[PDB]
């Protein structure tokens, strides 16, 4: 009765029988931009059901040695369905998201993943190892698209900051003996009312094992982690031709 849940939005429904409640980031729900916060004058377009729905974008395999992954929003969706098309045809975009990370196992497997959302997740490089070289992350690393990207140094989140403090950001844990999913609702976060869905990634989704996956020989060894997400209150403005980047 807090362990069970149903998420319905658009023409999509998600069910879970081992949930751990729902997190509403920074304590507030997604909402459309008000007339006083807005600055752009064209009347926006709010597609509703055709874009605010659940998209299942990717599946990763959790292994005893996995270091962790991250995805960028709205990057993961810029090339998917009707949401992607609007993001490409418009200069301005804004929305929130309902993120549902899925991972189930058996009562004999163990392990815990930390699922967190970190706004403005700027990636850094190891600087040629010695730190004397000002190298920079390539486009495929800063905006990895739907496949996501694997962390090289999870302890410092590939950005010189302690993952041990990542819990100061909206999160949930997927601890196999307890739940099989994490659900986080995130409002629009930015210093501007609208922005480019292409040039700016508002936040990153981090899925990192903190307690390694373990099980005895004989138990199903393939333990997938699937990422499903839904845009909420999507708004678009500044129409012209489609642009991919």
């Amino acid at each position: 009765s807090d362990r069970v849940a149903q998420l319905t939005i658009g023409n999509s429904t998600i069910t879970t029988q081992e949930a751990a409640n729902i997190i509403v980031g920074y304590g507030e729900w997604p909402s459309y931009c008000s007339d006083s916060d807005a600055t752009a004058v064209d009347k926006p377009t709010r597609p509703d059901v055709s874009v605010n729905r659940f998209y299942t974008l990717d599946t990763k395999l959790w292994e005893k040695s996995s270091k962790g992954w991250y995805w960028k929003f709205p990057d993961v969706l810029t090339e998917t369905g009707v949401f992607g098309q609007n993001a490409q045809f418009h200069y301005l975009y804004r929305s929130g998201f309902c993120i549902h990370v899925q991972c189930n196992a058996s009562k004999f497997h163990q392990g815990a993943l930390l699922v967190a959302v970190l706004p403005e997740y700027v990636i850094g490089t190891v600087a040629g190892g010695t730190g004397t070289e000002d190298t920079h992350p390539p486009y495929k690393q800063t905006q990895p698209g739907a496949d996501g990207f694997e962390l090289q140094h999870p302890y410092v989140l590939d950005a010189g900051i302690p993952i041990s403090q990542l819990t100061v950001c909206p999160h949930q844990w997927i601890n196999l003996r307890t739940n099989n999913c994490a659900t986080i609702i995130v409002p629009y976060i930015n210093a501007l009312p609208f922005d480019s869905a292409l040039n700016h990634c508002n936040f990153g989704l981090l899925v990192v094992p903190i307690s390694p996956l373990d099980y005895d020989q004989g138990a199903t060894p393939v333990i997938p982690i699937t990422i499903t997400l839904a845009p909420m209150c999507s708004e678009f403005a500044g129409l012209r031709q489609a642009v991919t980047q």
Partner: protein, 242 residues
């Protein structure tokens, strides 16, 4: 005396400090102010006045300078050909520098508002035609054809008794204000592009010129404001002015 304590800033001369200074001529009274036409109260008043936009900013020799004030149109081959293009950035090097809006803009770091360009056709009365004028918001590259430009904000202009048409370049920005745009990271603040296409064709009967010109006038909309006062990019002096 009364106990005081001097704080940092003491003795400094800040050019924008608004203070009180001793008056040199005590009990002096200025000549009264009679009525004089044309008093201006705010620079924004001048920004709403259209001045000529040098869209055709290509000729550079003294004898051809006047040609920058107008661009041409003439009979084509009906393939929706391109007539002209230019960036909408008002405080950027290019056509807008010819306008009073552009120049005033130079004295401010940031601006915000919609712009408007009114095009006046000066061909003969017997000349007709339909043009498509488009505004492409940031992110959209220079339209390769009329079909692509047509996807953005536009106006379809029909020549007739009303010699002119107005293209409004609405404020479509991610930020509340834009700083002056230029090549590099500051292109973040670009306003976009404006392109003029032939919707049908410039048509004329026997006896009338096959080429005519269009004059472009530009100014700001009433929601336009500027902030963060700064010095203009130019200094019109080489040596000492004697």
């Amino acid at each position: 005396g009364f106990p005081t304590e001097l704080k940092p800033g003491t003795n400094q001369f800040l050019t924008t400090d608004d203070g009180v200074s001793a008056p040199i001529l005590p009990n002096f009274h200025p000549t009264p102010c009679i009525h004089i036409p044309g008093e201006v109260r705010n620079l924004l008043e001048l920004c709403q006045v259209e001045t000529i936009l040098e869209v055709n900013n290509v000729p550079t020799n003294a004898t051809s300078l006047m040609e920058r004030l107008r661009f041409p149109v003439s009979a084509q081959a009906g393939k929706g050909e391109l007539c002209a293009v230019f960036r909408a950035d008002p405080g950027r090097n290019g056509p807008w520098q010819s306008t009073l809006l552009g120049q005033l803009c130079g004295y401010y770091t940031q601006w915000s508002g919609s712009l408007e360009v009114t095009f006046m056709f000066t061909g003969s009365f017997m000349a007709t035609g339909k043009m498509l004028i488009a505004y492409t918001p940031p992110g959209g590259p220079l339209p390769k054809d009329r079909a692509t430009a047509m996807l953005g904000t536009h106006v379809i202009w029909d020549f007739g008794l009303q010699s002119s048409v107005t293209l409004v370049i609405p404020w479509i920005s991610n930020t509340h204000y834009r700083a002056h745009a230029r090549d590099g990271v500051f292109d973040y603040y670009t306003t976009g592009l404006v392109s003029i296409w032939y919707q049908t064709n410039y048509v004329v009967p026997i006896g009338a010129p096959n080429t005519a010109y269009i004059i472009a006038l530009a100014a700001a909309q009433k929601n336009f404001t500027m902030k963060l006062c700064k010095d203009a990019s130019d200094i019109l002096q080489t040596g000492t002015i004697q």
